[PDB]
C-alpha cells in the first residue's frame, strides 16, 4: 500500500468534471415517402437513447468520484432500456413525395454533430488513466473501474460515428433516388401529350411503362436501404 490522499481527491474531481454535451439537432425526413419518415424516426429514437445513456454514464462517473473520496476518507479515519425499432404506388404520387421536403439537409447537419461528438469523447479519456502514487488492492480495483468507463466512452464514440454514418447514408440514398426516379414534371409532360394527341398514344405508352417500372425499382431500393438498425448502447 502506497497512498497519496491528495492524488485520490484530485482524480475524483477530474473523473466527474463535465464532459461535452451531446448534440441536440433533430433529424427531419428528407421527403414525404414512408421509408424516409421511418429512417428519420429511427434516428430520433436512437439519438434520444444515446442521450439517456450518456446521462447515466455521467452518474457512473459521479458514483466513481464518490468512491474515490470514500477511499480517501477511510485512509484518514484509520490514520435503461433498448431503442425501439420503427416498423417498416402510382408514379406521380411517388415523384411528388420524393420532391417534397428538405432533401436531406437536416440529415447532414445531424451527422456532423454526432461525428464531432465521437471525436470529442475520444479526446477526453485522460481522466481514466492509472494512478502515479496510489497502489494496493483498492487502487487496482479503482483502476479497473476507470478502465471500464474508458472502454464504455470509446464504445459510445463508435456508436456516435455509426449513427452519423446512418444519417449520411440516408442522405446519399435520397440524392441517388432523385437522380434515378422520373421527375413529376417529366411524367405529367408525358401524360399531357398522351392526353392531347390520340395518334401518339400507342407509341408514348412504352415510355410511360418504363417510367413506372423505374419508379417501382427506386422505391423498392429506398424501402430496403432506408430501414435503419436501432442503435443499442451498452449500459455504463
Ligand atoms: Ca442514372
From Swiss-Prot:
Source organism of this protein record: Mycobacterium tuberculosis (strain ATCC 25618 / H37Rv)
GO biological processes: biological process involved in interaction with host; protein secretion by the type VII secretion system; symbiont-mediated suppression of host autophagy
MF annotations from Gene Ontology: identical protein binding
Misc remark: BTP15, an inhibitor of ESX-1 secretion, decreases secretion of this protein without being bacteriocidal. BTP15 inhibits autophosphorylation of MprB with subsequent up-regulation of espA and decreased secretion of EspB and EsxA.
Protein name: ESX-1 secretion-associated protein EspB
Post-translational modification: Cleaved in the C-terminal region by MycP1. The exact location of the cleavage sites has been the subject of conflicting reports. Likely translocated as a full-length protein into the periplasm, where it is proteolyzed by MycP1. Proteolysis may serve to limit the secretion of other ESX-1 substrates.
Any single Gene Ontology cellular-component annotation: extracellular region
Free-text note regarding domains: The N-terminal region contains a fused PE/PPE homology domain. The C-terminal region is disordered.
Coiled-coil residues: none
Purpose: Required for host-cell death and may support an EsxA-independent virulence function. Secreted processed form of EspB binds to phosphatidic acid and phosphatidylserine. Inhibits IFN-gamma-induced autophagy in murine macrophages.
Family label: Belongs to the EspB family.
Subunit architecture: Mature EspB oligomerizes and forms donut-shaped rings. In contrast, the full-length protein does not oligomerize. Interacts with the C-terminal region of EspK.
Subcellular location field: Secreted
Residues of the full protein shown: 7 to 278 of 460
Domain of life where this protein originates: Bacteria
Key words, A-Z: Acetylation, Secreted, Virulence
Amino acid at each position: 500500500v502506497t497512498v497519496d490522499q491528495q492524488e485520490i481527491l484530485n482524480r475524483a474531481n477530474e473523473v466527474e468534471a463535465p464532459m461535452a454535451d451531446p448534440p441536440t439537432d433533430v433529424p427531419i425526413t428528407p421527403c414525404e415517402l414512408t421509408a424516409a419518415k421511418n429512417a428519420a424516426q429511427q434516428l430520433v429514437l436512437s439519438a434520444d437513447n444515446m442521450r439517456e445513456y450518456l446521462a447515466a454514464g455521467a452518474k457512473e462517473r459521479q458514483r466513481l468520484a464518490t468512491s474515490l473520496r470514500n477511499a480517501a476518507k477511510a485512509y484518514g479515519e484509520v490514520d435503461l432500456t433498448d431503442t425501439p425499432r420503427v416498423a417498416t404506388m402510382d408514379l406521380k404520387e411517388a415523384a411528388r413525395k420524393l420532391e417534397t421536403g428538405d432533401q436531406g439537409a437536416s440529415l447532414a447537419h445531424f451527422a456532423d454533430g454526432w461525428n464531432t461528438f465521437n471525436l470529442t469523447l475520444q479526446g477526453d479519456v485522460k481522466r481514466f488513466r492509472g494512478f502515479d502514487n496510489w497502489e494496493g488492492d483498492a487502487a487496482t480495483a479503482c483502476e479497473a473501474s476507470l478502465d471500464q468507463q474508458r472502454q464504455w466512452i470509446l464504445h459510445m464514440a463508435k456508436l456516435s460515428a455509426a449513427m452519423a454514418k446512418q444519417a449520411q447514408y440516408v442522405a446519399q440514398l435520397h440524392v441517388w433516388a432523385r437522380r434515378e426516379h422520373p421527375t413529376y414534371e417529366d411524367i405529367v409532360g408525358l401524360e399531357r401529350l398522351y392526353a392531347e394527341n390520340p395518334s401518339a398514344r400507342d407509341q408514348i405508352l412504352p415510355v410511360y411503362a418504363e417510367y413506372q417500372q423505374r419508379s417501382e425499382k427506386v422505391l423498392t431500393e429506398y424501402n430496403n436501404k432506408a430501414a435503419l438498425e436501432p442503435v443499442n448502447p451498452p449500459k455504463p
